[PDB]
Design a protein around this ligand. Structure first.
Ligand code: HEM
Ligand SMILES: NCc1nc(-c2ccccc2)no1
Ligand SMILES: [Br-]
Ligand SMILES: [Cl-]
Ligand SMILES: [Cl-]
Ligand SMILES: [Cl-]
Ligand SMILES: [Cl-]
Length: 396
């Protein structure tokens, strides 16, 4: 019998029985309808087939199941989406991202410096959560002592996207946006007058097809980057490292062979799939992999379910840093494929190599049945991950 689940309920994704539910979907009704009738593509095949038909499976209704669209790239269809993405792509060329390596590595070593003498830290609070915010913060011109304010704004906004909030939480979300809007428009004014080499400067100078980004668009697109690149990367760092620590053979492989790190990062992404789903609105009635869908309803793409689809990944519940091929969908697929995928991968690589060498005997304090996942229906991962290691002196 079908699992009795609510795919819009954050508690489903905090359950370590979600993958058992996915497995039933993939085997019995690939395009699944949950207890409330919400449609979701659970197989790798169905997700890809939906991704490849944007004119039928549109982003222009918004990518959350019961929230309207926002005027940002991820809530647009081509050709408007393509122009917006080309404009923002100025901040994410392969050259610009690769050149961040030294600065990201410095942040990684500073963060490890803050705990390496203690012999214990919360891997989430002290390493996985701060790094993505410090990288994005530095791109946006945020003073280091103000990162924590932005981290909380991002948390508030992620949480709004991850649930159906109350009025008090709707108001908190509006307040956080208002504060982010004020900050960003101040930056935009400052950089239109005296350009630097930061993200707002590059986005202001970007030109495509004779077009440029308006102030309104700069705020919206930088907000998408703030939210989209923060707590997502966090959860792959924490959850991916968790799997290295639970399977010591995997930890040991990476420690003795640095050339295995790219493959490890890909398996961390496949396993953690921080973005649990993105929605598509149907533009017409359609029979899709055996399920009738109605014009105007939203269908979820279950990226974690796809990442554990036995039709594509042999023994998907085995964490294997050497997995080849590893064509996971953590970043999605098609025209909306994650714009920050190179930056996310760079953050994950630089922090993980440093964790491996500087905390070489790292181990989890307690096991996973007690480690909670954050209840959220959009982006989710570990709340906390206490770890211990032999102390060492900082690098400075
Ligand atoms: C592990 C970290 C991340 C994950 C798992 C992730 C996941 C995703 C997914 C699933 C999508 C939509 C793909 C689809 O629907 O097919 C997306 C889009 C996007 N992501 Fe990420 N992301 C991550 C990090 C980042 C970072 C670091 C940035 C920016 C610095 C970023 C910026 C964006 C943008 C701008 C889009 C919209 C692309 C478009 O609509 O064309 N993401 N991401
Ligand atoms: N990188 C994937 C990602 N996208 C978002 C997002 C943030 C605000 C509005 C819509 C989408 N959060 O993570
Ligand atoms: Br299928
Ligand atoms: Cl949205
Ligand atoms: Cl559009
Ligand atoms: Cl930048
Ligand atoms: Cl949390």
């Amino acid at each position: 019998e079908a699992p009795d689940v609510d795919l819009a309920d954050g508690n489903f994704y905090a359950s370590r029985e979600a993958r058992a539910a996915y497995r039933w979907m993939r085997a019995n009704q690939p395009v699944f309808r949950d207890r409330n009738g919400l449609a979701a593509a659970s197989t790798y095949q169905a997700v890809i087939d939906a991704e490849r038909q944007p004119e039928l499976f549109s982003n222009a209704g918004g990518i959350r199941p019961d929230q309207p669209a926002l005027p940002m790239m991820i809530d647009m269809d081509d050709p408007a989406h393509l122009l917006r993405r080309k404009l923002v792509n100025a901040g994410f060329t392969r050259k610009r991202v690769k050149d961040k390596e030294a600065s990201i590595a410095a942040l990684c070593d500073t963060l490890i410096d803050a705990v390496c003498e203690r012999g214990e830290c919360d891997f989430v609070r002290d390493l996985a959560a701060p790094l993505p915010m410090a990288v994005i913060g530095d791109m946006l011109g945020v003073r280091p002592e103000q990162r924590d304010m932005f981290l909380r704004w991002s948390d508030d906004l992620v949480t709004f996207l991850s649930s159906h909030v109350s009025q008090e939480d709707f108001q908190i979300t509006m307040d956080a946006f208002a504060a982010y809007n004020d900050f960003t428009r101040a930056t935009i004014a400052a950089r239109r007058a005296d350009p630097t080499d930061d993200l707002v400067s590059v986005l202001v100078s970007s030109e495509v097809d004779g077009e440029r980004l308006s102030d309104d668009e700069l705020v919206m697109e930088t907000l998408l980057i703030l939210i989209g690149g923060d707590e997502t990367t966090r959860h792959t760092l924490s959850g991916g490292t968790e799997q290295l620590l639970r399977n010591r053979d995997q930890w040991d492989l990476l420690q003795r062979d640095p050339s295995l790190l790219p493959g490890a990062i890909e398996e961390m992404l496949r396993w953690t799939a921080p973005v649990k789903n993105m929605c598509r609105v149907l533009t017409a009635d359609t029979e899709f992999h055996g399920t009738a869908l109605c014009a105007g309803e939203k269908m979820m793409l279950l990226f974690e379910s796809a990442n554990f689809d036995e039709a594509v990944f042999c023994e998907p519940e085995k964490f294997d840093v050497q997995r080849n091929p590893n064509s996971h969908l953590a970043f999605g697929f098609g025209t909306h494929f994650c714009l920050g995928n190179q930056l996310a991968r760079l953050e994950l690589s630089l922090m993980t190599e440093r964790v491996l060498r500087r905390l070489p005997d790292l181990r989890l304090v307690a096991d996973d049945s007690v480690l909670p996942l954050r209840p959220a229906n959009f982006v989710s991962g570990l709340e906390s991950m206490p770890v211990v290691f032999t102390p060492s002196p900082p690098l400075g």
